[PDB]
């Protein structure tokens, strides 16, 4: 019957899959450039209906699980798995502590790799806040390294089959087994050498036979799941926030002055990370607009819908793209330029473009972790920027993301040098 508009190219074995695995943003932009607000590309044996623009995005984000389901939209997660405002102050204090612990051995000056640093830091902030400080204290660099391998195991080939015999998938499975072993060791460690946390709660549950209900494997899967949403997103966002501050010294200087003035009231990071830090918040908003951690959002249609005359049927993959929508020229003047001022009271481009400023989604599925993520950035930089001065150790334009996996991560090198203030 009727065929939806299809983007050019995709003449490879799996259609546009190979291009999606190399330059997904370019592919999605070409879909919009050639077809408009509703266009398709072929992801192996699956047609993806890519929606963009306010009108189409509104349909996407206002749709409940009854119309567009996310349940089976991400097959790459199956092998991997196998927030209260009142607690926010406590989490801010926890994050401050974790950052100070991470930079405790920095000394007077040195060099760091952003991916390595923030990936490890966010493993500690996430585990400490979500599972418990007790659990985080039993973790070290090994956990972060293994967790990284899990994220690297999200090749788009998962849309063909999540268990293909490729190196990244093999490393993904090996990494998960390694995490189970680490968790099993922690459990055994508590038996021999007794504030209780989530792990203690799970260990205490008994089966209908008196035996422990949960195995190290089941517990590990729960913990992986609890930490996955916020890890790669917060890690990447922290890295890009620092990169953009260094790329734009005027913003860097403004944030520094602001931080010094604000903390002059003598209140802690747990107080200030939950309150306005204007310049930093606008730099963060702009960083998220330009470098949204999730470049594409997927759904599986559960019924028949029509968007601008185009028909969507049950079973069809439907997607929205923060990467593309966040840069629509009509909605964001000079979309490729770093302009924190676009979020100040006069313009408020994030609030005005309810359906296209979507680094945190919109509508019914709006990010429930956004408040936590924003607080975390404020807490992290409140510490880092007041303690140290940062400079780029490589050309500004050489910092870039690796888009070869569904989980976007910073490519290396991403070297930065620091010196005590
Ligand atoms: C900078 C960090 C983060 C970014 C950029 C981000 C982005 C997003 C986006 C784009 C959506 C919409 C997804 C969709 O419509 O398919 C979303 C939803 C959501 N996020 Fe995040 N997120 C971040 C951190 C977190 C954290 C820390 C948590 C965990 C506490 C989290 C939990 C969720 C949940 C549960 C939803 C769905 C809410 C619902 O369906 O009602 N996010 N996030
Ligand atoms: C579970 C991983 C999944 C996701 O929903 N992540 C997610 C992260 C933060 N907040 C909400 C969802 C995803 C989707 C596309 C690309 C990479 C990973």
């Amino acid at each position: 019957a009727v065929a939806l508009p299809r983007v050019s190219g995709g003449h490879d074995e799996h259609g546009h899959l190979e291009e999606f695995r190399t330059d997904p943003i370019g592919l999605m932009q070409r879909v919009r450039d050639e077809l408009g607000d509703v266009g398709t590309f072929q992801l192996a044996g699956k047609q993806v209906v890519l929606l963009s623009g306010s009108h189409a995005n509104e349909f996407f984000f206002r749709a409940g699980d009854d119309d567009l389901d996310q349940a089976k939209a991400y097959p790459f997660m199956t092998p991997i798995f196998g927030l209260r405002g009142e607690q926010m102050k406590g989490h801010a204090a926890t994050i401050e502590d974790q950052v100070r612990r991470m930079i405790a051995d920095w000394g007077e000056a040195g060099e760091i790799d952003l991916l390595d640093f923030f990936a490890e830091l966010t493993i500690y902030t996430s585990s400490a806040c979500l599972i418990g400080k007790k659990f985080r204290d039993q973790l070290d660099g090994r956990f972060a390294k293994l967790y990284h391998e899990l994220e690297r195991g999200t090749d788009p080939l998962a849309y063909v089959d999540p268990y293909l015999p490729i190196e990244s998938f093999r490393r993904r499975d090996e990494a998960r087994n390694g995490l189970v072993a680490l968790v099993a060791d922690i459990m055994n460690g508590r038996i021999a050498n007794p504030d209780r946390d989530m792990l203690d709660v799970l260990i205490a549950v008994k089966a209908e036979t008196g035996t422990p209900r949960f195995s190290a494997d089941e517990i590990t899967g729960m913990f992986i799941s609890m930490m996955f949403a916020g890890h790669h997103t917060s890690s990447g966002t922290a890295s890009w926030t620092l990169i953009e501050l260094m790329r734009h010294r005027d913003a860097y200087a403004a944030v520094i002055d602001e931080l010094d003035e604000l903390y002059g009231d003598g209140r802690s990071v747990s107080f200030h990370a939950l309150r306005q830090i204007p310049q930093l918040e606008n730099v963060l908003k702009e960083t998220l607009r330009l470098h949204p951690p999730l470049i594409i959002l997927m759904r599986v249609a559960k019924g028949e819908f029509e968007v601008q005359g185009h028909r969507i049927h049950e079973g069809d993959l439907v997607a929205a793209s923060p990467a593309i929508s966040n840069r629509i020229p009509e909605d964001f003047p000079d979309p490729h330029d770093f302009v924190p001022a676009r979020y100040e009271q006069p313009r408020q481009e994030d609030l005005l473009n309810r359906w296209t400023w979507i680094p945190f989604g919109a509508g019914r599925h709006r990010c429930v972790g956004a408040a936590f993520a924003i607080m975390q950035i404020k807490a992290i930089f409140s510490v880092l920027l007041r303690e140290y001065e940062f400079e780029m150790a490589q050309p500004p334009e050489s910092y870039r993301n690796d888009h070869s996996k569904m989980v976007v991560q910073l490519a290396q090198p991403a070297a930065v040098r620091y010196r005590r203030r």
Side-chain angles (χ1 to χ4, degrees), residues 131 134 190 196-198 200-201 204:
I131 304 170
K134 184 184 182 179
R190 296 189 178 187
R196 295 174 65 73
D197 57 26
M198 189 72 85
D200 295 312
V201 172

Side-chain angles (χ1 to χ4, degrees), residues 145-194 196-207 210-220:
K145 290 301 182 182
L146 291 168
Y147 209 90
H148 183 64
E149 296 293 307
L150 290 180
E151 302 177 336
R152 291 270 303 191
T154 55
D155 192 304
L157 274 167
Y159 283 90
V160 172
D161 182 65
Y163 305 92
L164 292 175
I166 61 178
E167 190 57 31
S168 61
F169 285 176
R170 184 189 73 69
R171 295 184 62 162
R172 172 199 65 199
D173 298 332
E174 290 295 306
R176 191 179 184 292
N177 294 317
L179 284 167
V180 173
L182 286 186
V183 170
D185 290 329
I186 291 175
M187 289 167 70
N188 289 167
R190 296 189 178 187
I191 299 173
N193 186 56
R196 295 174 65 73
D197 57 26
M198 189 72 85
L199 179 52
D200 295 312
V201 172
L202 297 172
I203 291 175
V205 185
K206 298 298 186 300
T211 60
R213 177 176 181 180
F214 302 117
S215 64
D217 180 70
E218 304 176 86
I219 291 176
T220 302

